[PDB]
Amino acid sequence: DWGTLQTILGGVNKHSTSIGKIWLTVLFIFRIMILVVAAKEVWGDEQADFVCNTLQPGCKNVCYDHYFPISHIRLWALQLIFVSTPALLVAMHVAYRRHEKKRKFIKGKVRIEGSLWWTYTSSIFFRVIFEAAFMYVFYVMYDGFSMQRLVKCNAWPCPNTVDCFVSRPTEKTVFTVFMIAVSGICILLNVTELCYLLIRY
Amino acid sequence: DWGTLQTILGGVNKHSTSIGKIWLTVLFIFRIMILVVAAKEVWGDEQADFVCNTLQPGCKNVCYDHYFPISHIRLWALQLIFVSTPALLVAMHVAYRRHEKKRKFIKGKVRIEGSLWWTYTSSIFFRVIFEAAFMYVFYVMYDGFSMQRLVKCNAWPCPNTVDCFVSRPTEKTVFTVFMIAVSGICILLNVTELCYLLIRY
Incomplete structure (x- = not known):
């Protein structure tokens, strides 16, 4: 049930008019597609x-x-998890609060744009706080912006300075590019929506 | 030329009357026989x-x-070398000084018993100084009087305390007994001759 159900609540009925509402989520899918290709395929070799x-x-x-503390595909994973959280926490905050207020005062919209259009604004803030919290680590944690063919590893129980070699460090980087590029793109769309809620207040 | 020539000068013409004159040298041979069996045979395995x-x-x-700094068969060897030295240094001191004094005053025995029976006394002192200098190390250097089947070796680059195992540590000991026993026997005969030169002065 991964992906199809997050959209049932994630892609809600009728929220805003910016052409970046779907665009951002089409990537969100695209970005879990690229990762559900990388992971099981190129990272199995990492340790082997x-x-x-x-x-x-x-x-x-x-x-x-x-040298590989939290391997890339588990970072990429965590990213898509955290940045997935605001999206589904809001959609959860809506389908609950909307179903609640409705079926409670029907037998016995200033708060629909109040409560929900407000947590959604802080969500968009959260999205770009995460998308950029990792984008940060992914760039600071991992020795520049890619990985070399060999590393010179000083790990404790090696004799002095030894060589080691990774597997397909290019194919591994290639996918670090796309996933870091789309990690930036998905930052701007997120910040454009935080911008549009800063323009009209 | 090992053994047969050391006797040509070692077992000289007519030195003393104690029945321990030949006895000591018959062992000296015996003792190089036992070692010329041990060495090439039981110690090849030592390291392998x-x-x-x-x-x-x-x-x-x-x-x-x-654990095996100067292996046993090279100690045994050195013993038979050092304790061989006084024997052949004296025999060398004789066949030289005797051939010299003779062929020099023939054309132009108080010093034969003087010079030579005196260095021979200090030789006998030297013999037992060596025979016991090693007998000492062979007992102090090597962890008791024999060798165990396995040793627990703390050599630097092992992880903590490791096991190791020797080859035929009994056959190796067996020959450490004989060679240490005959190393004691050959001490007493040496000291009995140093005793007989302390009795009549």
Whole structure:
């Protein structure tokens, strides 16, 4: 039930008029499509085919870890999770509060644009707080903007400075580009919607 | 030319009357016979079949060394070398000084019993100084009087405390007994001759 149901509440009835309402969510899908291709495919090798040229037991495991603390595809994953949260927390805040107020005062819209159009504004703030909280780590945590073919790893139990080599560090980067590019694009659409709610107040 | 020539000068013409003159040298031969059996036969394995249960590169080499600094058969060897030295230094001091004084005053025995029976007394002192200098190390250097089946070796590059195992540590000990026993026997005969030169002065 992954993706089809998030839209049943995520793509709600009739919220705003900016052409960036759907655009942002079409990417949200696109962006989980690109990742549901990367993950199971290019990262399986991450640990397996990660070769350290040393016979020294401890080394290779320590050399992956010290170098791949939260692997990319689990970061990408967490991103799509956190940045998914505001989207579904709001949609949850709506289908609850709207169903509630309605079926309670029918037997016995200033607060529909009040309560909900307001939490949605802070959501849009949250979205870009996350989309940029990770975009940050993904750029600061991981030694520049990509990964090299080999790394020189000083992991504890290696003898002095040893070599190690990653698997397909280009294919791995390629997908770090797209996912970082679309991570920026999906930042602007998010900030344009935070901009439009700063223009008319 | 090993053994047969040391006797040509070692077992000289007519030195003393104690029945321990030949006895000591018959052992000297016996003792190089037992060692010329041990060495090439039981010690080849020392390093080869010395097994340390660890995958840790440095370890096994360091575990032999830290534990077998001057291997037994090279000690035994050095013994038979040093304790061989006084025997052949004297015999050398004789066949030289005797050949010299003779062929020099023939054309133009108070100093034969003086010079030579005196250096021979200090030789006998030297013999038992060596025979006991090593007998000492061989007992102090090597962790008791024999060797265990396995050792627990803390050699640097092992992970913590590792096991290792020696080759035929009994056959190795067996020959440490004989060679240490005959190292004691050959001490007493040496000291009995230093005793007989202390009795009549």
